[PDB]
Design a protein around this ligand. Structure first.
Ligand SMILES: CSC[C@H]1O[C@@H](n2cnc3c(N)ncnc32)[C@H](O)[C@@H]1O
Ligand SMILES: CSC[C@H]1O[C@@H](n2cnc3c(N)ncnc32)[C@H](O)[C@@H]1O
Ligand SMILES: CSC[C@H]1O[C@@H](n2cnc3c(N)ncnc32)[C@H](O)[C@@H]1O
Ligand SMILES: CSC[C@H]1O[C@@H](n2cnc3c(N)ncnc32)[C@H](O)[C@@H]1O
Lengths: 119, 119
């Protein structure tokens, strides 16, 4: 089955012009663990997850841009699911932003979603 | 295959008498996302993961005991692996403390480990 029909459906993103503590509220608010960071257009710059929030406390880092995993692993909306499953394990991550061909963010898949194909 | 032979091998735990920020350093130091919280004996009271650290910032919580998921899902050292895999998805968590029969902590399995049985 294709990623286009499993993914979380309007993405929640953030420009890097926000405080660590705001991001945290964002994550906690929607009950999410993955926050794609987008530029002014909407194109994909990096990814924050609760791990980064705890990195920020741990090393006294203060800005989103300082800690966002600058190089994000992503999925294409026509990329078969099974293949994304394999991808997240092999790289040990639980979520990928889904991108259109311009690196604009159209959604997100988490293992949380993949495990409704586990039954 | 049995959990006893996949698990991470001396556990890293913490009594709740530590600061959020220390826990974070603990997680970042060993490169872990799961911190079992133990009492004076060593028996299993709750679990902290980086998610809780971001909950702590989010709601201005200040103590480990305030935020540790008081009721932890665990695995037995003779519990077959496959079954623990199923357990973490169905409950959407990536790590379980492994317990002996007195609820003392003997190890931990993460999906990170299970995915070396994925090949
Ligand atoms: C974390 S489980 C709850 C849901 O949140 C979704 N999710 C996680 N991160 C995001 C995000 N940045 N935008 C939209 N949905 C998300 C996941 O795909 C899952 O369905
Ligand atoms: C696995 S957690 C360690 C790092 O993984 C990063 N991370 C989580 N998901 C992804 C992804 N899809 N691509 C790249 N890095 C990621 C987080 O920002 C964290 O710094
Ligand atoms: C998170 S991936 C790196 C390793 O850390 C292990 N790990 C995670 N949390 C703990 C812990 N509290 N004590 C010992 N090992 C851990 C995992 O089982 C994995 O092998
Ligand atoms: C899935 S993340 C949301 C909550 O899950 C908790 N959590 C993570 N692993 C476990 C586990 N093995 N048992 C119970 N709760 C857990 C974390 O402390 C967090 O508050």
């Amino acid at each position: 089955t294709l990623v286009k029909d499993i993914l979380s459906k309007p993405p929640i993103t953030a420009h890097s012009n926000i405080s660590i503590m705001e991001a945290a509220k964002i994550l906690i608010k929607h009950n999410i663990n993955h926050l794609p960071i987008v530029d002014e257009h909407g194109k994909l710059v990096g990814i924050i997850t609760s791990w980064d929030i705890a990195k920020a406390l741990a090393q006294n880092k203060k800005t989103i841009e300082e800690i966002m995993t600058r190089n994000v692993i992503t999925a294409h909306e026509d990329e078969p699911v099974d293949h994304v499953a394999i991808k997240m394990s092999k790289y040990n991550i639980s979520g990928v932003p889904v991108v259109d061909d311009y690196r604009r963010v159209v959604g997100i898949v988490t293992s949380e979603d993949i495990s409704r194909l586990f039954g």
